[PDB]
Design a protein around this ligand. Structure first.
Ligand SMILES: [Ca+2]
Ligand SMILES: [Ca+2]
Length: 436
């Protein structure tokens, strides 16, 4: 009576924050997602760069309104300062609405990310262009290019209002909004950002940011409240959520779905997925075992190269969550992610599709089967069979019935059953024999 594996989300993530992707390119990704049995496209649009412009970008914060055309010009410029992509700067509202509709018609959902308080180079740049002072976080004379200072009330207020504006747009047409929250001040702190934010509590009078991590919890919780008010489920990457398993600074909103991408590394001690589940968070398995950075296309070409990602897909199943502590961790689904850390890299659709295809093949019981050729085969049957012999007619009608009788919820693992049924139909049609 249950289809627990197929009921999971299967998601492909595309980094269209750092790098421009056209509507045509994204529709092709949606097509392949549908074909391979995925349920959703996770489209980062704010991730270092910001590459999605609403028709009205006016922002009310700090006792004033920043005019829509000024906000647009500030964001376009700020994104260009991060990376001026010769292929394009941003998707428009019309293009996004069309894209979401295109995906919806195929049974594919779209999940956007607009990242903060890290990975927001372009938003920080935009704020400065609007005239907001000192938005960037700094750590002992090292200014972060990507991370907002949570002590800066004006920068924080603007950012929250911007997330609110995007969330209002995505309301009703999507179900999940990814607020990001990953990798606080990674540049300025040599990947010690969460330690830095927590440090003052335990090492006072050493110049660490006062109430740094407490302010981050408040910030995360406020974004969650904003997203939830629009009927959307907030999602965030795991690394800063109870960093160091420290629950003493406050509590994260339980309605935040956790995208569990990392089990951490030496000197970067993240909460286990066990702890996060126990605190009451649903988890989307986003294991970085499966990561692919565009342009790192073969073994030896760096971390998250395509060969590494395909190896990760082969060796780490959709059910294998980072840092389980040996516990059985339930999941809402799995997400394979392609990134543009070097956004000048060439986007290769065939390589992305290979990654997507391997993820589906390695976990085939979880992915939907493809009925599109079955549907087309049925469309291609001759409508009128009267001029053919009763015997050959019966064979076609039986073969048609057989395809139409297939379980409508088969997995990719059972694709052969569908394909066999199509072949049988084609055979019976070919064998239709005109009456004497
Ligand atoms: Ca990173
Ligand atoms: Ca190789």
């Amino acid at each position: 009576a249950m289809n627990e594996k197929l009921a999971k989300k299967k998601i492909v993530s595309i980094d269209a924050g750092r790098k421009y992707f056209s509507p045509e390119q994204l529709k092709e990704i949606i097509d392949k997602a549908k074909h391979y049995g995925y349920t959703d496209l996770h489209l980062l649009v704010g991730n270092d760069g910001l590459r999605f412009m609403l028709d009205d970008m006016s922002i009310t914060a700090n006792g004033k309104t920043y005019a829509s055309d000024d906000v647009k010009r500030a964001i376009e410029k700020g994104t260009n300062d991060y990376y001026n992509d010769p292929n394009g700067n941003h998707l428009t509202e019309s293009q996004m609405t069309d894209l979401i509709n295109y995906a919806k018609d195929k049974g594919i959902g779209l999940i956007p990310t607009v990242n903060s308080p890290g990975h927001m180079d372009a938003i920080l740049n935009a704020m400065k262009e609007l005239g907001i002072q000192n938005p960037n976080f700094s750590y002992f004379g090292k200014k972060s290019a990507r991370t907002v200072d949570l002590d800066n009330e004006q920068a924080v207020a603007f950012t929250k209002a911007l997330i609110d504006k995007y969330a209002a747009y995505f309301a009703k047409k999507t179900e999940i909004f990814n607020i990001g929250l990953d990798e606080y001040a990674n540049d300025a702190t040599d990947a010690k950002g969460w330690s830095v934010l927590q440090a003052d509590k335990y090492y006072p009078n050493e110049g660490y940011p006062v109430k740094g991590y407490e302010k981050f919890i408040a910030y995360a919780n406020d974004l969650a409240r904003i997203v939830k008010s629009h009927g959307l489920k907030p999602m965030a990457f795991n690394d800063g959520i109870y960093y160091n398993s420290d629950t003493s600074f406050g509590s994260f909103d339980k309605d935040i779905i956790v995208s569990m991408w990392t089990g951490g590394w030496g000197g970067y001690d993240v909460a286990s997925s066990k702890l996060l589940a126990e605190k009451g968070h649903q988890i989307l398995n986003t294991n970085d075992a499966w990561y692919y950075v565009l342009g790192r296309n073969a073994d030896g070409q760096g971390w998250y190269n395509l060969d590494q990602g395909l190896n990760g897909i082969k060796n780490t199943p959709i059910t294998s969550v980072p840092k389980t502590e040996g516990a059985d961790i339930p999941i809402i689904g799995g997400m394979v992610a392609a990134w543009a850390d070097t956004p000048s890299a060439r986007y290769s659709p065939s390589r992305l599709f290979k990654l997507m295809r391997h993820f589906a093949n390695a976990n085939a019981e979880y992915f939907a089967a493809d009925y599109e050729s079955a549907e087309q085969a049925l469309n291609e049957v001759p409508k009128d069979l009267n001029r053919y012999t009763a015997e050959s007619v019966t064979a076609v009608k039986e073969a048609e019935k057989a395809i139409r009788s297939l379980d409508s919820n088969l997995s990719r693992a059972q694709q052969d059953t569908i394909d066999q049924a199509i072949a049988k139909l084609q055979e019976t049609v070919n064998n239709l024999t005109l009456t004497p």
